[PDB]
Short mmCIF file of C-alpha atoms in Angstrom, two decimals:
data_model
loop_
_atom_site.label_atom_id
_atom_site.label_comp_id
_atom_site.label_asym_id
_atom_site.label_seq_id
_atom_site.Cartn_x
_atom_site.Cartn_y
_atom_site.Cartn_z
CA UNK A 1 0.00 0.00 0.00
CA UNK A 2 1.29 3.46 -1.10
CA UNK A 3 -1.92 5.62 -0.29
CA UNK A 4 -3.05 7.16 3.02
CA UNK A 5 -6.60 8.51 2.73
CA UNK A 6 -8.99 10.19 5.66
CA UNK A 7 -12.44 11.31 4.92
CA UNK A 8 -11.64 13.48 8.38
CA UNK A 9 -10.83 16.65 6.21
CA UNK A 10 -12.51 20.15 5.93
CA UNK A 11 -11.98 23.17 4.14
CA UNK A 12 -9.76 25.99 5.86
CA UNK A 13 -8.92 29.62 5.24
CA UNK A 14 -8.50 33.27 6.86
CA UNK A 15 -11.33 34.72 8.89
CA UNK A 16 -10.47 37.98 10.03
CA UNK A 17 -12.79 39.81 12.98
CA UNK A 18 -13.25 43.67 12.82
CA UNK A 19 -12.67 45.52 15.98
CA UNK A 20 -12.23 49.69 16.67
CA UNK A 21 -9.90 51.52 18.18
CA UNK A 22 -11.73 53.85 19.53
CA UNK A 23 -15.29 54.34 21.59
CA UNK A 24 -18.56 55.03 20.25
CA UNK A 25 -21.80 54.99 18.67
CA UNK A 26 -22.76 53.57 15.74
CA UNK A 27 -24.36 55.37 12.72
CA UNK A 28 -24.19 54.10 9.90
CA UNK A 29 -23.30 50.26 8.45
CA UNK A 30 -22.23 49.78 5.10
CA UNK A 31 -22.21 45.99 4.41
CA UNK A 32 -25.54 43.48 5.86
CA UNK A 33 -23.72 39.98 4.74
CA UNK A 34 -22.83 38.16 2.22
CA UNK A 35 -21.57 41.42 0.34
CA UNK A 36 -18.19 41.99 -1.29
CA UNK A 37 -15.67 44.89 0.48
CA UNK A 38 -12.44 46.27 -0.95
CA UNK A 39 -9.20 46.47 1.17
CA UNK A 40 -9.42 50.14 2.76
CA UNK A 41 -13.51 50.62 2.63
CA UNK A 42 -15.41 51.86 5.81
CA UNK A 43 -17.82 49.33 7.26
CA UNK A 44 -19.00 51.15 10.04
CA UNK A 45 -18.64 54.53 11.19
CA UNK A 46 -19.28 56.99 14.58
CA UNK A 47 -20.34 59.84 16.61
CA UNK A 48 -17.95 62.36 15.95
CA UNK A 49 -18.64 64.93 18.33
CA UNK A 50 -16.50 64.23 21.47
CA UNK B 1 -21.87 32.57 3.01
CA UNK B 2 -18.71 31.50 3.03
CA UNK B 3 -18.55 29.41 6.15
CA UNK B 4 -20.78 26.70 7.74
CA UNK B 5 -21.32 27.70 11.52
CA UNK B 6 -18.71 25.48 12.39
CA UNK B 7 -16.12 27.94 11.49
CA UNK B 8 -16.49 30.41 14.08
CA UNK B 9 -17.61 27.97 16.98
CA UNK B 10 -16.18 28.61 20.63
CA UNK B 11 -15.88 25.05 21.33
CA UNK B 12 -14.89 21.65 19.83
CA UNK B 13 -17.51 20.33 17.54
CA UNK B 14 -17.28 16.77 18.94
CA UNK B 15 -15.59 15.60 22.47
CA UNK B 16 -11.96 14.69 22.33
CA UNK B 17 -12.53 11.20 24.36
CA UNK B 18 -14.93 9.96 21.90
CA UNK B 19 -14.48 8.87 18.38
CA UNK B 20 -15.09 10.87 15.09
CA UNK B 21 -18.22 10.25 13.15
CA UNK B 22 -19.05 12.03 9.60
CA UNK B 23 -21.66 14.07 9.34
CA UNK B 24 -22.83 16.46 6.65
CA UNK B 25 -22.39 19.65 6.81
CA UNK B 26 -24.93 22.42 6.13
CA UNK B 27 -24.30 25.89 4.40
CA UNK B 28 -27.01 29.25 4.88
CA UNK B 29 -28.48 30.81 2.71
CA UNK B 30 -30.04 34.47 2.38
CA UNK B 31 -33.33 34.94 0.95
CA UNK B 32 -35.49 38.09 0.87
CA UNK B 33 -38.91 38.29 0.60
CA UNK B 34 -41.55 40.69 -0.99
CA UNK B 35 -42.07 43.73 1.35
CA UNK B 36 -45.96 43.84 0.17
CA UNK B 37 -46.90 40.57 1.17
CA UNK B 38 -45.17 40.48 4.95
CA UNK B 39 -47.57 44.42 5.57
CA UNK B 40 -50.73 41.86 5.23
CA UNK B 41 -49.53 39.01 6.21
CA UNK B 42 -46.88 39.48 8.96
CA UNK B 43 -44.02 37.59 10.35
CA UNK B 44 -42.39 37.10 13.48
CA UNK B 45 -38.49 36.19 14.17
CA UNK B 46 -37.72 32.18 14.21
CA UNK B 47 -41.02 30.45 12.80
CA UNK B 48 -40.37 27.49 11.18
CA UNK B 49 -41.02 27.45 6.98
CA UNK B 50 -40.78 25.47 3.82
CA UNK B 51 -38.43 26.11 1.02
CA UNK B 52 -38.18 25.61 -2.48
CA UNK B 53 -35.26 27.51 -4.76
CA UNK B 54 -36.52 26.86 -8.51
CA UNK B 55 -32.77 26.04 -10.29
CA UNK B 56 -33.05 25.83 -13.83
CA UNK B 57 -31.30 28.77 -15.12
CA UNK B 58 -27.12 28.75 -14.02
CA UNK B 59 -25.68 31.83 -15.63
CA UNK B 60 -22.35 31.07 -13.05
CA UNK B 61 -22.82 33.83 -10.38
CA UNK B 62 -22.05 32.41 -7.13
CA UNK B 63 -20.20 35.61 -5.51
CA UNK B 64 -21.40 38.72 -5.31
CA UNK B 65 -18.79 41.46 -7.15
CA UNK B 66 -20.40 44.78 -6.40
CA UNK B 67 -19.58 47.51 -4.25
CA UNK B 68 -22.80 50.03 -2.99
CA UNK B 69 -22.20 53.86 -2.20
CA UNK B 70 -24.71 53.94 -0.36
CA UNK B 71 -25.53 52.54 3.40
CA UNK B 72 -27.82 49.42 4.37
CA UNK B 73 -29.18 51.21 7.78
CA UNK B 74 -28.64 54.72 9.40
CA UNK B 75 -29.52 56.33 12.60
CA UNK B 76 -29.31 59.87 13.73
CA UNK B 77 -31.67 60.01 16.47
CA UNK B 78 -28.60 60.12 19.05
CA UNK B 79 -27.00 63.23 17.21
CA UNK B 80 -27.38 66.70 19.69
CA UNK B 81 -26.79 70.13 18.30
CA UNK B 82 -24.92 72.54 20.08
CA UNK B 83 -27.34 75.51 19.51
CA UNK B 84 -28.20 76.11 23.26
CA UNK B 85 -25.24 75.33 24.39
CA UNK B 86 -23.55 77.83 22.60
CA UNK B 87 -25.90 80.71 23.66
CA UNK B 88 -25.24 79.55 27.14
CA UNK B 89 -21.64 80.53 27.07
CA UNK B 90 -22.45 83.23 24.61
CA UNK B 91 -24.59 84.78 27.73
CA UNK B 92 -21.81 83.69 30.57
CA UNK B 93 -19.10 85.64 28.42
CA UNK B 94 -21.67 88.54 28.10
CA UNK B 95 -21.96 88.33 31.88
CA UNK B 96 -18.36 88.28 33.56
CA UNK B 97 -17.24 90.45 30.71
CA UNK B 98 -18.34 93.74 32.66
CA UNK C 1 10.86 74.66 16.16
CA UNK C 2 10.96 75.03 19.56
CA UNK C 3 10.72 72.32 22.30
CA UNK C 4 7.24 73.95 23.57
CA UNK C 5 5.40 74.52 20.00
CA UNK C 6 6.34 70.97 18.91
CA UNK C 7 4.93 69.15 22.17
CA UNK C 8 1.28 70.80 21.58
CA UNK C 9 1.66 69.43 18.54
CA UNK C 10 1.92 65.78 19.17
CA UNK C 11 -0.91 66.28 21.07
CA UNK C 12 -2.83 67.83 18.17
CA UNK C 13 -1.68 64.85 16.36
CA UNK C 14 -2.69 62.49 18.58
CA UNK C 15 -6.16 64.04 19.00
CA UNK C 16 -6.77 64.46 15.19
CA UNK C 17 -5.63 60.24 15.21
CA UNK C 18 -8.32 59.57 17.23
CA UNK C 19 -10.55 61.72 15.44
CA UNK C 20 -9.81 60.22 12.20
CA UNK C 21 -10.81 56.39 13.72
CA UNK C 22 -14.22 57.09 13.91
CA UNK C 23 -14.22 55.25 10.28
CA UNK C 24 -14.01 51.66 10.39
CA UNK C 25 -12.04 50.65 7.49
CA UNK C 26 -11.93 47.21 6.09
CA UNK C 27 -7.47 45.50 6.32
CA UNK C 28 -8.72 42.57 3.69
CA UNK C 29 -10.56 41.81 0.47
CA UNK C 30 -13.18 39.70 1.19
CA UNK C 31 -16.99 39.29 2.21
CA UNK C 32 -19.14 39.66 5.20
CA UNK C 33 -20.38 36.53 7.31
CA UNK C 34 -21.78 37.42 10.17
CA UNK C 35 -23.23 40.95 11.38
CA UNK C 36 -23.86 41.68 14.71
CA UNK C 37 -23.68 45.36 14.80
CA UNK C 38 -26.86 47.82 14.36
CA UNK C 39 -27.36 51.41 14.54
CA UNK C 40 -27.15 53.04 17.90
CA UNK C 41 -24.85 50.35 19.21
CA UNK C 42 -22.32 51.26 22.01
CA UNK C 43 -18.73 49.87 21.12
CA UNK C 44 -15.61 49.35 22.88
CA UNK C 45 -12.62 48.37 21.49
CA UNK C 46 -13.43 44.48 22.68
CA UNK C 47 -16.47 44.45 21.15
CA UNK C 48 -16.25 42.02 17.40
CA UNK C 49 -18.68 43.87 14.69
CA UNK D 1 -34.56 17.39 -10.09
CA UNK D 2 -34.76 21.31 -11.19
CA UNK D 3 -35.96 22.65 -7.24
CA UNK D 4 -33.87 22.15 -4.19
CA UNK D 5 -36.31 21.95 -0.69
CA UNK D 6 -35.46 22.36 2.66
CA UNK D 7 -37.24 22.47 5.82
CA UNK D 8 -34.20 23.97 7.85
CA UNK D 9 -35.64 27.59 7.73
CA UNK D 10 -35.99 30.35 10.13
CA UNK D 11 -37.76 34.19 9.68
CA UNK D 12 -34.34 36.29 10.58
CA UNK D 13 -34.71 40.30 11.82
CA UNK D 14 -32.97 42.80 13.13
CA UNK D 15 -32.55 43.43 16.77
CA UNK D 16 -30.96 46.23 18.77
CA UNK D 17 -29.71 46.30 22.28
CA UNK D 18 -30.78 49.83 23.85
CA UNK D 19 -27.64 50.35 26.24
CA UNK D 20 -26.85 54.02 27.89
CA UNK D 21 -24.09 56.49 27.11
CA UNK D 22 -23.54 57.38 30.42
CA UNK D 23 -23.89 55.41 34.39
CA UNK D 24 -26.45 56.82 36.90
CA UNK D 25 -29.66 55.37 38.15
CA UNK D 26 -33.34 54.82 36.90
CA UNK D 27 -36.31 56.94 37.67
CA UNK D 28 -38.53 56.62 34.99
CA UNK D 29 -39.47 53.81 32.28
CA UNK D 30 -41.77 54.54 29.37
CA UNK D 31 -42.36 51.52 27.55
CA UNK D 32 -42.97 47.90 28.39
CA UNK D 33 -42.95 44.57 26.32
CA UNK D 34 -45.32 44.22 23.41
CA UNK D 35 -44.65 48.19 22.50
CA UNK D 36 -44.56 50.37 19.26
CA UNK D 37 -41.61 53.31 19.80
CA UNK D 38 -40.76 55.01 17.44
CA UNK D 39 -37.15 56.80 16.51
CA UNK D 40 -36.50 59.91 18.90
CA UNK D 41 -38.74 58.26 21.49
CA UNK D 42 -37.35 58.52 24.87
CA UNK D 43 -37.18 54.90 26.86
CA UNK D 44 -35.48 55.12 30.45
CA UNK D 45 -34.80 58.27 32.32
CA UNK D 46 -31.76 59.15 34.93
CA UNK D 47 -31.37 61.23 38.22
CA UNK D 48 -29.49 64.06 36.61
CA UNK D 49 -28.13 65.21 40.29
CA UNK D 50 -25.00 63.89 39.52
#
């Protein structure tokens, strides 16, 4: 025998999660799901007055 | 979507003491619905329903490629302008200016 | 030039960094899977979106 | 065959979780469950002493 086979195997990429830097309030949301982005697009954006 | 729940799960999917068993996996899907029908006839958040996607025509678009200008959902109700605010201090700076 | 001007100005800079973060931006090409953030949310820098 | 069926579904919504800007305590609390608000509707209601 020269073959090793599992039917044990998935799928598996990069997930990346989306976190601020700041503190705030939401306002607006730009993507709902399943909807392409481009590197460097706002997804969510903030209160600006303090 | 482009993950099947597993992906993103806190915790093993089976226990580590037992053995592995295959089972098959299931992938969402987003459907929306006709806004004039759901006024009449409402809905309510997780009741159960039957499905049926009709298949026939494949022109090959399985990922979405475009880009919207414009938002899904806005709020301004927490916004405050600073009108009497600044006629507050506009009156204090009258005051203790002699 | 001098050391006084030049430390109010980090501070300006500092301040107009934080300002500027109020916009989300996306780091990767890709697409949206999961969306648990709605108008009128408060968010911390803990919070996933 | 030319459908695909599945019996697997759920209605999905929206759902927001009213949280305050600000700490304090509660004096007032103008709506209860099973209640149309609408946007710009004040909810809950602080001791402003501090």
């Amino acid at each position: 025998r020269h073959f090793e086979e599992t039917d044990d195997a998935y799928v598996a990429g990069n997930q990346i999660q989306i976190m601020s830097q700041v503190s705030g309030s939401v306002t607006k949301v730009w993507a709902d799901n399943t909807d392409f982005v481009k590197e460097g697009d706002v997804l969510v954006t903030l209160d600006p007055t303090d | 979507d482009m993950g099947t729940g597993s992906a993103f799960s806190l915790l093993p999917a089976q226990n580590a003491t037992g053995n592995w068993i295959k089972v098959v996996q299931r992938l969402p899907v987003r459907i929306e619905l006709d806004q004039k029908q759901l006024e009449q006839y409402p809905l309510r958040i997780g009741l159960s329903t039957l499905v049926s996607v009709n298949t026939t025509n494949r022109d090959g678009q399985v990922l979405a490629n475009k880009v919207r200008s414009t938002p899904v959902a806005v709020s301004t109700a927490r916004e405050i302008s600073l009108a009497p605010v600044n006629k507050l201090i506009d009156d204090i700076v009258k005051a203790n200016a002699g | 030039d001098q050391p006084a001007v030049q430390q109010a100005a980090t501070e300006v800079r500092n301040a107009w960094l934080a300002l500027e973060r109020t916009r989300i931006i996306s780091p990767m090409t890709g697409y949206v899977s999961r969306r648990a953030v709605q108008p009128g949310a408060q968010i911390s820098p803990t919070t996933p979106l």
